Amino acid sequence: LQMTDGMHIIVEALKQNNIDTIYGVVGIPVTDMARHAQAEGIRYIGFRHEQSAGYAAAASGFLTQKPGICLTVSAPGFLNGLTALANATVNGFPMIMISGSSDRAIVDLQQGDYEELDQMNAAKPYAKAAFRVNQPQDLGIALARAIRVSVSGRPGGVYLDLPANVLAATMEKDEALTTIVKVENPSPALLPCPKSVTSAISLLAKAERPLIILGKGAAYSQADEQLREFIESAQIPFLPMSMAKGILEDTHPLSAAAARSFALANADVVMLVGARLNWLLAHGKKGWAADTQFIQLDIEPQEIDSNRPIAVPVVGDIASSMQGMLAELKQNTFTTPLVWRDILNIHKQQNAQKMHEKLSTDTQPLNYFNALSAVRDVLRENQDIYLVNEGANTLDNARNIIDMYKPRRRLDCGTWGVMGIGMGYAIGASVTSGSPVVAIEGDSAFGFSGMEIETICRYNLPVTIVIFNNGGIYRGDGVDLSGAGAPSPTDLLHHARYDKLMDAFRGVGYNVTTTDELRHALTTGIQSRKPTIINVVIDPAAGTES
Amino acid sequence: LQMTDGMHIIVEALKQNNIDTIYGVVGIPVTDMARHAQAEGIRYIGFRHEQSAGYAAAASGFLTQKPGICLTVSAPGFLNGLTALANATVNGFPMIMISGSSDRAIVDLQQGDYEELDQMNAAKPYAKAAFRVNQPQDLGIALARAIRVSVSGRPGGVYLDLPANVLAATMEKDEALTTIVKVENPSPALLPCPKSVTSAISLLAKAERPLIILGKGAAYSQADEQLREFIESAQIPFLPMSMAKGILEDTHPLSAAAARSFALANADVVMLVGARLNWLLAHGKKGWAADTQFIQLDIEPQEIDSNRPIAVPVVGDIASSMQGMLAELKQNTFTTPLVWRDILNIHKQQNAQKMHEKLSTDTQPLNYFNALSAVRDVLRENQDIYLVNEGANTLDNARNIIDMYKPRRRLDCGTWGVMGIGMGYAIGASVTSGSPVVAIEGDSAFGFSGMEIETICRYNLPVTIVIFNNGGIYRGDGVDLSGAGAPSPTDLLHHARYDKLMDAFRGVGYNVTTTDELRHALTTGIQSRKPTIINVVIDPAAGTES
Amino acid sequence: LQMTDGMHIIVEALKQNNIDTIYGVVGIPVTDMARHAQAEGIRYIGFRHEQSAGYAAAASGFLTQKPGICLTVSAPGFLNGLTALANATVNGFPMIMISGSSDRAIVDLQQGDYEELDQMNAAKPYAKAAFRVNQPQDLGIALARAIRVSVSGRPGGVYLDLPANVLAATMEKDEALTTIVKVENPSPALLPCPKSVTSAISLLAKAERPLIILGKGAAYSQADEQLREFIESAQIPFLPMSMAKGILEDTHPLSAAAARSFALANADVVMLVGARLNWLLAHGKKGWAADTQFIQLDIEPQEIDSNRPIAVPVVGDIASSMQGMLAELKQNTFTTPLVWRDILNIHKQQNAQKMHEKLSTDTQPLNYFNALSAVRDVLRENQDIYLVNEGANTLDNARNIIDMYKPRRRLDCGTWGVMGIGMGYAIGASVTSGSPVVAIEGDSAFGFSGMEIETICRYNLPVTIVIFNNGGIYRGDGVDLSGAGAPSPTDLLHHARYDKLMDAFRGVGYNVTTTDELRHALTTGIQSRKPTIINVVIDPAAGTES
Numbered sequence A, B, C: 001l002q003m004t005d006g007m008h009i010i011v012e013a014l015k016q017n018n019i020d021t022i023y024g025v026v027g028i029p030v031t032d033m034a035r036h037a038q039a040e041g042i043r044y045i046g047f048r049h050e051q052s053a054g055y056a057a058a059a060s061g062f063l064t065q066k067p068g069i070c071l072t073v074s075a076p077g078f079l080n081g082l083t084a085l086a087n088a089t090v091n092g093f094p095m096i097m098i099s100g101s102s103d104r105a106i107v108d109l110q111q112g113d114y115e116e117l118d119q120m121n122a123a124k125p126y127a128k129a130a131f132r133v134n135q136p137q138d139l140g141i142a143l144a145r146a147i148r149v150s151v152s153g154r155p156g157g158v159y160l161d162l163p164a165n166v167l168a169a170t171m172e173k174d175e176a177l178t179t180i181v182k183v184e185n186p187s188p189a190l191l192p193c194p195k196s197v198t199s200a201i202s203l204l205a206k207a208e209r210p211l212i213i214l215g216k217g218a219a220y221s222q223a224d225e226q227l228r229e230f231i232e233s234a235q236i237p238f239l240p241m242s243m244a245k246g247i248l249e250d251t252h253p254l255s256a257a258a259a260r261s262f263a264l265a266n267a268d269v270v271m272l273v274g275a276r277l278n279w280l281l282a283h284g285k286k287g288w289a290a291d292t293q294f295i296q297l298d299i300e301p302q303e304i305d306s307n308r309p310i311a312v313p314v315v316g317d318i319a320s321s322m323q324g325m326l327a328e329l330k331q332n333t334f335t336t337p338l339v340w341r342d343i344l345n346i347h348k349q350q351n352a353q354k355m356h357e358k359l360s361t362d363t364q365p366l367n368y369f370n371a372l373s374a375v376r377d378v379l380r381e382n383q384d385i386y387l388v389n390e391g392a393n394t395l396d397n398a399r400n401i402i403d404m405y406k407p408r409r410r411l412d413c414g415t416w417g418v419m420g421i422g423m424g425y426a427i428g429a430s431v432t433s434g435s436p437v438v439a440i441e442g443d444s445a446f447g448f449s450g451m452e453i454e455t456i457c458r459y460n461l462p463v464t465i466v467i468f469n470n471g472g473i474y475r476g477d478g479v480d481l482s483g484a485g486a487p488s489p490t491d492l493l494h495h496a497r498y499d500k501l502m503d504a505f506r507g508v509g510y511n512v513t514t515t516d517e518l519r520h521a522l523t524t525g526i527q528s529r530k531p532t533i534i535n536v537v538i539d540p541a542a543g544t545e546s
Ligand SMILES: Cc1ncc(C[n+]2csc(CCOP(=O)(O)OP(=O)(O)O)c2C)c(N)n1
Pocket: A390, A391, A392, A393, A394, A395, A417, A418, A419, A420, A441, A442, A443, A444, A445, A446, A448, A468, A470, A472, A473, A474, A475, A543, B025, B026, B027, B028, B073, B076, B077, B080
C-alpha cells in the first residue's frame, strides 16, 4: 500500500499540465515542494524578492498563453507576490501564484499563528479568482480551475492557496493519481456574432479616414499573420500601442506611430484591437475627433461602452474575430482612401525629420536621443532579442525610438506604470525563450528590482542591462529648496557607478559616456551572452518631469 | 486675497504636528509635496522601493511613539508601501502612509484611470483606519484623526489618501490656517481597574515560581525605570522577547533568557507585559506547565483570552499599569522564592557553558557562533549602536548571542517574520537617532532590500551591514535532486562578494574569513561612521533548515 | 439656457433604455427621482421592504433578459436591497440596484454622515460590478455599463451608486442630452468553437445511455424551440432542473424527472445545458456513475472543471451553442438507444404509480400529496399562470407534483435556497407579464415577506397565495424538550389563520381543510384576478425534516 502526500500530488498535477518552470522564493511551508518539483524535472528559478518572481511568471504568460507559475511562502512572502499578481490581472497576463499558508483553525480564530493571514481573501481584489485547497484529493481539480480561470476571458492572475496541512496530508498513491486533471484546451475559442463582423467591415468600407489601434490584447492573441493580412489587404493605417509594437514591424509603411496625435484627432472610424479606451488612449476624449465611430474587438463584453459609446462591438477572442473579419473583407473588399494615407505620411515625415535631428546630434554629456540612437543601431542588427524597458524619460523615449521587428518582444511598465518590473521581466523572457534580453532601465526604475542581478548571474542568463544614469527620478539636477544642501526628493547619488554592482556576482560591467562607447559595450554585451550592466552617463538636465 | 492649496495645507499640518522627517518615493502626484515639505524644513529621505520607506517610518514610530510618515504615489507605489503598512499594524508600530491617488470620478466608474485603484478600500484590511480627503478644508482634521488612530490603543499603521485634486484644490490662506489641527497628547493614559492591580500583586505574592515576560509592547511603552524597579524590588526572573531585549540589560542577573524552556515549563504564575500568547510563545500550550496562571498587561481588551484563559487581565496602557503595580507592590511587598531563582540559575549556567564552547571554538570556514562571538566582543564596546537583524540562522543566533544594553535598540523581522526590513529599519533608526547602526543580515534576507545601500550612501548614514554569507537560504550546500546540476531552490551564488556592491556608491567594503578579520572590520566600520558592507564567509553547512 | 440635473438625466437614460418599471422603497435621497420617473411614464412599484423589491427586479430580469431595476435609499435601505442583489448574482438573474448614497467627503473620512456606508465597496462581493457616479455627465455611460455588465456572461446583479450630490448637480440641458447612451444589443452572441460542437455530437452519438440536464441557464436563454428540436431529433432523455421545468412540458415522453436517481446513477454521457455541477446535482459525485463523461454548454469558461473534469466544454451563449449543436446533429444524425429509453420508462412508471397512490388517497387533515393533487387539478385547467414556490416540504413536493406546460413560469428559492422570495417574485412576475400568479408558500417561508400582501392589494395584482399551514418549520408537532411547554424552535402559532391577514387590506381570504374546498378556492382566486390568500390546513405531522 504505497502512500503519497499533497506536495507530491500538486507537483504531479503541474507536470501533467506541462508546467516546466516555477519562479519563486522558498521557505516554510514550500521548500520541499520546490525541491521535489526540481527533482521531477521542473526548472526552478529562485528570486531575491517575490515581486520579481511574480513579474517573471506574468511575462512568461504574456509570451506563451500558458500561465506562469509563481511560488511563495505564507503572509510576508505572499504579500510581496500579491503586488505582482495584482499587476498581472491589471495588464491581462495569465499567471498562477501558489502560496503556502498556515493553520486554518488558528488563522480563522486570529490567535496569532505563524505568518497569520487569510491569504485567499487578501488576494481576491487583485485576482480573477482565489482558491484554497484543504483536501489533497482536491488539488488536481483546484489546479485545473486555476489554469482555466487564468487564461480564459481576459487573462489574469489567479491565487492558489495551499495550507501547510494539505501539503503534508496523505492519501493512497493509486487513488491520488485518479484525482489529477490534465486540462486540454484551457481557453476555447469564442467566436463573434457574424452580424457584428459584417457591420464592422461595412463601417470600415465607408470610412474616409480609418485607423486600427493594436493593443496588448492584439499582441497576446498571436493572430500575427491575420492582423498583417487584414491591414495590408485594405491598406489601413495602424497605431501600435507599446506592447503591440512588432506585430507588424515598426518600420512598416502603414504605421502611424510618428503621427499619433494627428491620427487620433482626424480618424473618423477607429478599430480597437485588444485596446481599451483607458488613460493610455485619453479615454477617447482629449485629442480625439468629436464624433469618432468605434469598432472594438475585445473578449470582455463588460469592457464595451466603458468610456465612449462603441458603434460596433465585436466581442470574441481576438484570433477568432480576426479570422471572421478577414473572411468578411475577402467577400467585400475595400481599400482605404489613398489621400488619408498620403496626409498621414506628410505628418509622419514632419516628425521623422525632427526625431532624426535629435537622434543624430552629438552632445556631452549624452542625452536620451543620441544614446538611444546608438542602442537603435545595435538592436537593428540583433533582431532575436527581447527588450525590457522602464523609467519615465527612459521609457517614453525608448518606446518611440527602439523599433520592434517581431511580435511579443517588448515588455514594459504596462497599464499601471509600475517601476520594478525590469529584472523579473528580463528573467521571465530569457528563461522562457532561451534568447538574449536587453533591459533599458531608468536609474530610479532599476533600483526597484536591482538585487535580481544576482539571480541573473546565478542562472547565467544572457541579460544586458543598460542603465540610463541621469542621477535621479526624471532629472538629476534637483535642489533642496530650504537651502540646507540635502539631496532633493528626486535626486539619486551623483555619478553612481551601477556597472560596478556586477563585480559582486562575477558579471560584466561597462561605464560609457559617448555613443561610440555605448555602441561597442552593447554589441559586446549581447554577443557575449554574459550577464552585463552598462552604466550610461546621461545629462542630469536632459529629462523632463511629468 | 492670498490663496493657498491642499498641498501647502497638508505640509503646514505636518509641521504643526512636529513631523520633522518624511520617508518616501516620489512621482505623480506627490513630488511637489515632497519638495515643498523639504522647503519648509522637513527632512525628506527618498528610497529605492516604497516598502523600505514604510519600514523606516514604522521603525521611527517604534522608537519614538510619534507615527513615522511614509509618502507614496498612487496604485503601483501605494501597493508597495501597503506591504510595509501591513507589517506595522501586525507589529504594533505607529505610522501613517500618505499616498496620492487619481481622479475619484474615473476610479469610481472603473474606466481605467492613470494608476487606478480604490486605495482607501485596499488599505482597510492592513490598517487601523483608512481615510480619504476630498476637500482641502478637511486636511487638518484628517491628519489629526490619522495621528490619534495610529498611536492610540495598540499602535499601528493608518492610511491617508490624498487624491491629486485635493492637493491642487485652493482656498483662502487665512481661512485655511483656521482648519489646521495641532494634536496635544494624541495617546492619553488609560489606567487599569485598581481591583485588577490588587489581584495581580496578590497572585504574584502567592507564586512559588513567578516569571515576567517582556514583549515588544513593554519596550514600546518606555516604562523602562518602572519595569526595572518592579523586577528588582520583588526579584522576579524575566524573559525578554526579541525587541524587549535591553529594557533591562541582557546581562542582568534576573534574565532567564538562557533557560527559556525550563522557565516556561516550570513557572506557575506568568506575568505577560505587552506580550501576546501568539506563535512566538507557542500560544501558551506546547512547552508550558499544564496549569500556568496568567497575569496580562495589555492595552487591548480584545486580546484577553485569545489563546489561554487569563486569570488576571490588567487592561490599560503599560506605563500606567506599571505605575499602579509598583504602587501596590510598595504597599504589599513580597520577594520571589530564592529556591526558584537558584534552580533557574542552574539551568542558565548549563546552557551558558554550552554556548561559551560554541562561541569560543575556532572553525574554518566560520560558523554562526564564532562569527557572532566576534560581533559580540565589538558591540560590547559600542553600546550606543542600534542593532538591526534578519535572516533565519543569522536571526535566531544573533538574537541569542548579541546582548542589548539599552532599550529599543534592537529591530528585527518581528511577528510576521518578514525578510526585507533590514535596510529600512537601519535607515529609520539612523535618521531618527543620529546614532550608528549595525545590521546583521542573512545573505538571502539582505537581497530583499539591498538596493537601499544607495540610499544609505546618498545620506551618508553610519550603517555597518554585516552579511552572513553562507551562500543560501538556511544553508549553501543544496543539490539539484534531478541530477541536472542547477542551483537548488535554497542556493544563492557561490562566494558572492557583497562587499563589492559598495564600490558602485562610493561606500566601504570588507571581505572577512576569520574572527580576527571580522573584529577589525566591524570596529573600523562603526568608528568610521561610513556606509560599510562586511561580507562574512560562513560555512555553507553550518546552518539548520526550519 | 435651459438647465437640468442628475436626477432628470438618470430618469431620461432609463427611459431611453426601455426601462418601463422600477421596483423600490423611497426616502432620502431618491423620493423625487421616483416621483419624476413615474411622471415620465415609468411604472413605480413601492414595497414594504427592499429585499422584496430586489427579488421582484431579479424575477423580471429572469423572465425578459432585460435587467430589473431596484431603487433604494442609502445605508439601511441599501443593505436590505443588497441581500436581494446577492441572490440575483448567485442565481444568474440580471438586475441593477440603484441606491442613493450620502456625502462622499464625509463618508470617506468616516465622520458619521447621515446613513454612512461606502456602499459601492459594500456591494462588490455580491455584484458583477459596483459603479459610483460623481459627475452628472457620466450618468449615461454609467447606466450603459450597468446594463451591459448585468446581462452579459452569466447575468447577475450590478450596483449603481448615486450620491445625493450627483442627483442635485446641474448641467445645460442640450449638453446633458448628448451624454445619454442607448445601448443596442447589450449581450451580443458568443458562438462556441466549432470543434467543440463536433466533439459534443460525436460523444453523444457513441453514448449507450445519454442524458441532457436542463438548468436555469437553459431556461433563461429562451432557446426553447432549439432545445425541443434537438431532444426530439435524437430522442435524448432529459432532466429539467426546477426553473427549467416547462421548457418542454413536464409530461413530455422523454422527461426522466420521475426516474431522476436511476438516470444520474446510470447515464454514461451527460450534457449539461446551463446547469452547474453544484450541490443541486450533488457535484457529479454521490449518486452518479463513477465515470460519467460530461458535455457542458455554459457561457462562463470559469465554470468548466469546477467540480468534475469536463470531457467536452461547449463554451458560448446557450442559444448560439444550441444552434450549432442542432446544425451539426443534422449533418451527423443519431438516435439514442431504445434500450436506454425503455429502462428509464420502466423506472418512471414505478415512481408514477407510487406517486398516484399518495396523490389520490384522501386524508383528514390534508397532507402534501392530496393537497397538491387538488392544486394540480386546478392548474391543469389554468395553464397561463406563473407559479411561485418556497418552503421545505411545500417546495420539494410542489416541484415534483406541479407540472409546468410553458417555459419560464416557475420561480422558486433557487441556488441559495432562500426563504423570502415568494411575494417579490409574485409581484415581479405579475407586473412583468400581466398574468395571474399562484404562490405556493410554506407557512414559515411566507413569514419572510408576508407584509407585501399590502403591496399586492395596493396595485390590485392577480396573485393567489396558497399557504401550506402545517404550523411550523418542516412540521408543527415539535415539543419543548425542557418540559417547560414553550413552543419548540420549529413551531409556529397553532392554527394561525393567514387568510384573515387580507382583511386589513380589503383582499380576499379562504380557509380550506379539504381537497374540494381547496379546488374551489384556488379556481376562484385565479379567475377573479383578486389578491387572495388561501389558508390550507395541513397535517402538522405530514412533513419531514431537512
Ligand atoms: C512602484 C512605483 N513607485 C513609484 C512610481 C513613480 N515613478 C514614475 S517614473 C519613476 C522613475 C523615473 O525615474 P527613472 O526611472 O530614473 O527614469 P528617467 O526619467 O530619470 O530616465 C517613478 C519612481 C512608479 N511608477 N512605480
